[PDB]
Design a protein around this ligand. Structure first.
Ligand SMILES: C[C@]12Cc3c[nH]nc3C[C@@H]1CC[C@@H]1[C@@H]2CC[C@@]2(C)[C@H]1CC[C@]2(C)O
Length: 154
């Protein structure tokens, strides 16, 4: 009862690209670029596709940095999110109907307007750590329970 997703962070030496979700689910929060993995696609190829489709960037190399399971109490399906990083991109971000991209300096990451779990694992991603996490939510705002650990192998 777990569904595969990817989440990709475009991370350069002193800045990160985030996209504000403009409409629909999770609207009003900044996030990386993510989506469902397709039948017949590897997780990595899904991550590349989601990044390119949502941001307009071309990614040349991607690195897996974490895996986070999300549970919403009462909802049967878990989200098994595979998190990736890249700093080897081409092109410029494209604003769309769905997504407004902005670059952020690392000291100005907008955690108050992100999913609350990000406050826990983003610092690990920024420090080039790898991790395994689990977050149990009640609705979209409240973390009931979590675990997070650093790993050498995702
Ligand atoms: C993985 C997300 C995004 C996120 C960033 N930091 N933390 C999170 C957790 C959050 C958990 C819910 C996910 C949501 C992604 C969009 C999902 C899968 C949504 C469920 C349905 C939808 C819109 O497809």
């Amino acid at each position: 009862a777990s569904r595969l997703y990817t989440l990709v962070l475009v991370l350069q030496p002193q800045r990160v690209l985030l996209g504000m979700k403009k409409r629909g689910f999770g609207a009003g929060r900044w996030n990386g670029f993510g989506g469902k993995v397709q039948e017949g696609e590897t997780i990595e190829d899904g991550a590349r596709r989601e990044l390119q489709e949502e941001s307009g960037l071309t990614v040349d190399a991607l690195h897996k940095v974490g895996q986070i399971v999300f549970e919403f109490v009462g909802e049967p399906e878990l989200m098994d999110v595979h998190v990736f990083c890249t700093d080897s991109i081409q092109g410029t971000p494209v604003e769309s109907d769905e997504m407004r991209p902005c670059w952020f300096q690392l000291d100005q990451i907008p955690f108050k307007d992100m999913w609350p779990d990000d406050s826990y694992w983003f610092p690990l991603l920024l420090q080039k750590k790898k991790f395994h996490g689990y977050f149990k939510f009640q609705g979209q705002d409240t973390i009931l329970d979590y675990t997070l650990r650093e790993v050498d192998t995702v």
